[model samples]
Target: HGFIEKPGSRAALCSEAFGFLNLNCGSVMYEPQSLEAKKGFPHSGPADGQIASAGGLFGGILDQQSENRWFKHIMTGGEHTFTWTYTAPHNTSQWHYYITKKGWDPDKPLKRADFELIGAVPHDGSPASRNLSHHIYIPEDRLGYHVILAVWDVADTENAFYQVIDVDLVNK
Candidate 1:
């Protein structure tokens, strides 16, 4: 399971990754754990057991049914890089990153309809390495705070690692 290692760790080294608690992809029981409250980790494991494919976004994927989704504010201007470290890299299919639409509700749980596809990268056959970090670039147009959802699909499994990140953009 991939998670935000720390504010500046490989998993989330960008400024967008800062100011948030270190969250883990919980045990692989395929049940939502601590996901019904704000700042909750959404999926049971790093693998998308319940959440659908890269395009499928369900209301259930929204965290904290009782409260708003917790997000950290980040500043960026043009292109922004999102990277992750793979403890055990597999034959990856592709990586996708989605950003919240302008004027979307920040207090509400994230909905697929709330986002727009921003970046994608198809992986080569070789496994991902720590030195050769996996990365993607997000476009620069959006302003203010927005949610960036990252999906890493596996080529050999029925799941992908899902990461929901929030950022506050500036004209830098």
Candidate 2:
């Protein structure tokens, strides 16, 4: 199991921020890195509205969309380093980071049409390190609340873990 760290992904953020955010992921709080589903996202991985929960994991609470329900990181638009911290890292295939469209509804459940690919790191069939990082670029025009859906594809397994980073982009 693995999760996008720091620049805090949903479960990853809720995993530890319960200390300050007064929020919890129930059982998910402990398995922030376990949003694993089948591979081929934006087409085959998770279903619409189930993207955040990675195909209804943990009762689909992560699918609950609201402006204030989850904590939002203050991020600047441009290039940023996103790290995936794995508890049980495995062989990898590729990594993809997607962002919500410039104008998407934040109040409704997330749909496929609401996002666009923002970053992709193709990988060979090799072992993944415990800590993996990728350079993902956020379009400068994006602002306000947005979700960066990160997918980690495993080379040997039929699965891939997913993470979502909710952030409020600030222009610098």
Candidate 3:
């Protein structure tokens, strides 16, 4: 999960996913974290994080969990942050991002959200090996209150599912 901060507004917007998710079938679920174990190791699927100790979703390559939870913080002219952790599969690792428009307007989709494709980076301090931890960042415009999704294709399978986490305002 992550936080939202308005740099000049002194108003922070935050939401915790606890276990919100977007399935492969384009369905959305707002529920509790699953205790059911996945099929493989190096797992990376839905995550349930503790904000009190800093937020993050830690998982391996084979593990399946979603890290689409977020928190909002009002910016006082400082840094805005978003953090999560993920692992890349052995075959071919890659990732993409998506955002859902606010107001849920059905007329215009393009004005609704943002999308991006990102390549994988080798994990830090692992000496050519990779282990997942926490991936955190502050959006350039400082997300105040918006809904975004991070989709990863560890196997280079474009059939990958979508996970919506970290909602914030892009212009806020």
State which candidate has the highest TM-score. Answer: 2
Better of 1 and 3 by lDDT: 1
How many pairs in model 3 have backbone atoms within 3 A of each other, for residues 3 or more apart or on separate chains, i.e. clashes? 35
Residue 27 local lDDT, model 1: 36
117-141 in candidate 3: lDDT tens per residue?
A: 3224443344543433233344555
Ten-residue segment with the worst summed lDDT in candidate 3?
Answer: 25-34
Pairs in steric clash, model 2 = 2-33
Name the runs in model 1 displaced over 4 angstroms. 3-7, 10-71, 104-113, 125-142
Error of 3 at 75 (Å): 7.4
- For candidate 2, the TM-score is 0.57
* lDDT of candidates 1 onward, in order: 0.50, 0.59, 0.34
Tens digits of per-residue lDDT, candidate 2, 54-110, equal 464322234446332334567787888876566764777777777665554778556
Pairs that collide in candidate 1 are: 74-168
lDDT of 1 by residue, 25-85 (tens): 2232121211211124564333334445533344424542314344455655654444355
Better of 2 and 3 by lDDT: 2
What TM-score, computed on C-alpha atoms, does each candidate reach? Answer: 0.50, 0.57, 0.32
lDDT of 1 at 50: 40
